[PDB]
Amino acid sequence: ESAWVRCDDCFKWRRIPASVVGSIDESSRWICMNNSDKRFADCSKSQEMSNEEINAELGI
């Protein structure tokens, strides 16, 4: 499935594989450029969908 990570530089939420999210804990610095998905891999790129749409996809 997908998980979502917040960029520590611009605070947009980025879709990442759920098989990797466990390695990103709250001490870790993660930014857009670290994203392997190059549709959404610098801080200028708009967020993929709204926060409420993300939470709906996650069922939270």
Binding site: A3, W4, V5, D8, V21, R29
Partner: peptide, 7 residues
């Protein structure tokens, strides 16, 4: 970093 995932 903050993350969100399915519960």
């Amino acid at each position: 970093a903050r993350t969100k995932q399915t519960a």
